[PDB]
Chain A
Amino acid sequence: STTTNSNSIGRPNLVALTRATTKLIYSDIVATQRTNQPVAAFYGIKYLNPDNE
């Protein structure tokens, strides 16, 4: 009685591949504007009182 014990399996079917990578949030979290020079100078400009606060 030939059964699946006689038959020999050549290869597995590849089915599914999985690479585990985080949902990556640097895009939503931080305010990004590319810099065209190796040093990046953000101004910030403060509207004061006569008391400087």
Chain B
Amino acid sequence: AYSIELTQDLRAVHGMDADAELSGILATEIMLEINREVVDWINYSAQVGKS
């Protein structure tokens, strides 16, 4: 939910693509979380060692 007045600002001042930056942080966030999930089902589901 990025503003339509943002992209024009951010295309002009920073040259960055606005949209393609959010699609950058959403696509990365889900694949970071889905990846933080399985590592957290390994450490959740792992027996206690040295016992």
Interface residues of A (CB under 8 A from B): 36-38
The answer to the question of B48 belonging to the interface, with a C-beta cut-off of 8 Å to chain A, is: no
Q: How large is the interface on B (under 10, 10 to 19, 20 to 34, 35 or more residues)?
A: under 10
Interface membership of B13, Cβ < 8 A = yes
What is the 8 Å Cβ interface bit string for chain B, positions 6-20, against chain A (1 contact, 0 not)? 000100110000000
A38 to B13, CA, bound (A): 8
* Complex interface: chain A residues within 8 A of B12 (CB): 36-38
Q: Mark B23-36, 1 if CB is under 8 A from A, else 0.
A: 00000000000000
List 6 A-B pairs, Cβ < 8 Å: A36-B12, A37-B12, A37-B13, A38-B9, A38-B12, A38-B13
